[PDB]
Structure 1
Amino acid sequence: MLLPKRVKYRREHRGKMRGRAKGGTEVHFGEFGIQALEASWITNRQIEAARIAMTRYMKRGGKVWIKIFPSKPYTAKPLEVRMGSGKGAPEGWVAVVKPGKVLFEISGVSEEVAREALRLASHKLPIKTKFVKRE
């Protein structure tokens, strides 16, 4: 459950996930990676689920290199409450994702193993994905 240690503002606007990514569109730390085909917010619980999934499938395998970090916080008012009276309290932390963006990489491991692990992770994630490799 990743966390930014320190932040300026505990409360931010949400934002808009228009367009494609700026960077991180291609694997370069590792060999076999995964990228997105949509745009969405992703949570520390999602990423750690995917991470531990692939690492359990691999059991010693090489290196991973996540390519993101949930910097963004997201609020949520308490339950059964009218509107207004200030912005809701923070709940967790979020990473924002554009399409064309690489999320997880892999090295030290064969292609079939990598593809299967990333499949497993994709099923923990909400969005549509693609298997990718380095050029």
Structure 2
Amino acid sequence: MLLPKRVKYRREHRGKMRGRAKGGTEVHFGEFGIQALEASWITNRQIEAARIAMTRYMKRGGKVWIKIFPSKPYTAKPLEVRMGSGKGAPEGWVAVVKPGKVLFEISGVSEEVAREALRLASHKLPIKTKFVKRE
């Protein structure tokens, strides 16, 4: 459950996930990676689920290199409450994702193993994905 240690503002606007990514569109730390085909917010619980999933499938395998970090916080008012009276309290932390963006990489491991692990992770994630490799 990743966390930014320190932040300026505990409360931010949400934003808009228009367009494609700026960077991180291609694997370069590792060999076999995964990228997105949509745009969405992703949570520390999602990423750690995917991470531990692939690492359990691999059991010693090489290196991973996540390519993101949930910097963004997201609020949520308490339950059964009218509107207004200030912005809701923070709940967790979020990473924002554009399409064309690489999320997880892999090295030290064969292609079939990598593809299967990333499949497993994709099923923990909400969005549509693609298997990718380095050029």
TM class by shorter-chain length?
Answer: over 0.9
Q: How many angstroms does 1:13 deviate by?
A: 0.0
Specify the alignment match of 1:89 in structure 2: 89
Q: How many angstroms does 1:10 deviate by?
A: 0.0
Q: Secondary structure at the match of 1:34?
A: strand
Where structure 2 has 5 or more consecutive residues not aligned to the other structure, the ranges are none
Give the TM-score normalised by structure 2. 1.00
Q: How many angstroms does 1:37 deviate by?
A: 0.0
In 1: Cα distance, 2:124 partner to 2:77 partner? 26
Q: How many angstroms does 1:8 deviate by?
A: 0.0
Q: How many residues align?
A: 135
Q: Secondary structure at the match of 1:2?
A: coil
Q: Secondary structure at the match of 1:60?
A: coil
Specify the alignment match of 1:13 in structure 2: 13
Q: How many angstroms does 1:106 deviate by?
A: 0.0
In 2: Cα distance, 1:28 partner to 1:108 partner? 13
In 2: Cα distance, 1:108 partner to 1:100 partner? 24
Q: Cα RMSD over matched residues?
A: 0.0
Q: How many angstroms does 1:40 deviate by?
A: 0.0
In 1: Cα distance, 2:118 partner to 2:16 partner? 27
In 1: Cα distance, 2:56 partner to 2:112 partner? 15
In 1: Cα distance, 2:129 partner to 2:75 partner? 27
In 1: Cα distance, 2:32 partner to 2:90 partner? 35
Q: Secondary structure at the match of 1:126?
A: coil
Q: How many angstroms does 1:103 deviate by?
A: 0.0
Q: How many angstroms does 1:76 deviate by?
A: 0.0
Moved over 3 A (4+): none
Q: Deviations over 1:72-102 (max 9, x none)?
A: 0000000000000000000000000000000
In 2: Cα distance, 1:117 partner to 1:37 partner? 18
Give the TM-score normalised by structure 1. 1.00
In 2: Cα distance, 1:23 partner to 1:46 partner? 21
Q: Percent identity at matched positions?
A: 100
Where structure 1 has 5 or more consecutive residues not aligned to the other structure, the ranges are none
Q: Deviations over 1:22-81 (max 9, x none)?
A: 000000000000000000000000000000000000000000000000000000000000
In 2: Cα distance, 1:9 partner to 1:107 partner? 36
Q: Secondary structure at the match of 2:94?
A: strand
Is residue 2:47 matched to residue 1:47? yes
